[PDB]
């Protein structure tokens, strides 16, 4: 239930959903993350050749505004086959190839919106995703066929048409807003109608384990840099430069933040509860890491939900397995590995 009103290069991981067994169906994953802007070309290679039917997740981004994507495909690895992932991006002189080296908590609802302008190529690209905790449950893509808000989790498919109509009406409103803003921000920063620019929106609400309201968010960004955001008290704005102060004043004079507070404190919480209940078999589970040590000292963790975890040198970003679970490892060059997870009885410790 949504509202009703710089360049970073990617990090690449190539891995399987499950541990590889020669002859056993599996899933090959390429997780690209931490990059900006969102234009990226990702290929999955099999023996120096492009794999034909590769799918990918809906575009989303992290706190720092950097985007992340999961490209994946079903495959049965054998003895001779070798695999890799290729990534192109504006920050790369040539596409990078990475080979597949075979050898009790709070809750949240978050909506992510991304608009990218396409000078002289039609409307801007618009992508919207919705999350409960670390489980995405709705999406919208302007380039897609439906032109509707679409489910991405079982527990949201129960909702009837009045819900899906209202969501489709609300997302298209979020789209129009971004389209207008793209032309506006172009004007206030004196940029040409020939360049491509990105506008990102994020908002949502947190609740304790008692499902009572904890925190609320509403942030806006231009070309990967902060533009305006709601303070933690949800009653005032943070403008980032002389251009965003003009918006801050127009919004404080129209008391926009008051309508936001109501949603973030009331409506957002209310539907987060309805979702948590409707998908309790999913959202309210906790899966514990299937964990062991790899020797360079490397600590491993597989098939755990939610993604929040701590291992304590090289620490690789947590990555989706593609089945709802996540993975992570850490490395260091009389040593111990500490594993604080929100689904383990008590912290674990590991040593050779």
């Amino acid at each position, epitope marked *: 239930y949504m509202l009703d009103l710089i360049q970073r290069t990617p990090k690449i991981q190539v891995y399987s959903r499950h541990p590889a067994e020669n002859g056993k169906s599996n899933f090959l994953n390429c997780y690209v993350s931490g990059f900006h802007p969102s234009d990226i070309e990702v290929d999955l290679l099999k023996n*120096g*050749e492009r794999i034909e039917k590769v799918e990918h997740s809906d575009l989303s981004f992290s706190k720092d505004w950097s985007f992340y994507l999961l490209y994946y495909t079903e495959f049965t690895p054998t003895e001779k086959d070798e695999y890799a992932c290729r990534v*192109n991006h504006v920050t790369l002189s040539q596409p990078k190839i990475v080979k597949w080296d075979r050898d009790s908590g709070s809750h949240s609802m978050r909506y992510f919106f991304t608009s990218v302008s396409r000078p002289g190529r039609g409307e801007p690209r618009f992508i919207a995703v919705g999350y409960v905790d670390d489980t995405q449950f709705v999406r919208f893509d302007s380039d897609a066929a439906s032109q509707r808000m679409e489910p991405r989790a079982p527990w949201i498919e129960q909702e009837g048409p009045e819900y899906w109509d209202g969501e489709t009406r609300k997302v298209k409103a979020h789209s129009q807003t971004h389209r207008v803003d793209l032309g506006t921000l172009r004007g206030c920063y004196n940029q040409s109608e020939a360049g491509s620019h990105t506008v990102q929106r994020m908002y949502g609400c947190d609740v304790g384990s008692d499902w009572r309201f904890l925190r609320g968010y509403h942030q806006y960004a231009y070309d990967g840099k902060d533009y305006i955001a709601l303070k933690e008290d949800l009653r005032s704005w943070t403008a980032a430069d002389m251009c965003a102060q003009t918006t801050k004043h127009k919004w404080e004079a129209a008391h926009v933040a008051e309508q936001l507070r109501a949603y973030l404190e009331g409506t957002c919480v209310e539907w987060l509860r309805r979702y948590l209940e409707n998908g309790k078999e999913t959202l309210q589970r906790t899966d514990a890491p299937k964990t062991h040590m790899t020797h360079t000292l490397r600590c491993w963790a597989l098939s755990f939900y939610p993604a929040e975890i701590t291992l304590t040198t090289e620490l690789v970003e947590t990555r989706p397995a593609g089945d709802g679970t996540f993975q992570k490892w850490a490395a260091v060059v009389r040593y111990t590995c500490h594993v604080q997870h929100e689904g383990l009885p008590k912290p674990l410790t590991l040593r050779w």
Partner: nanobody
Amino acid sequence: EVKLVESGGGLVQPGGSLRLSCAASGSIFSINTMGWYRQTPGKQRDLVADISSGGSTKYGDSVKGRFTISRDNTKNTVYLQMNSLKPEDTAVYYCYGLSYSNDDYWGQGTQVTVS
């Protein structure tokens, strides 16, 4: 380990055409996909067209329909027929190839200019 010999570049009038050719050395079983990326005014190089030894092709959106890639049944050699060239196709075109172990090799490139 592999060397890529490029030819066919140069200057051409708008609306003209050019045929690029790239030939791989080494063992005939040491290269699978071959194709071309092209330099942007910026830092990156964009995909133009490539083809697997079995004939599977992929093109960059901005040359779809105008450019065609092909391969010699015998030798490891690919051909890029560029038609209806525009000034925005001016760039250095780099041939590349992939080993059957997903190792990438890259040629020196060939400047293509469209008045």
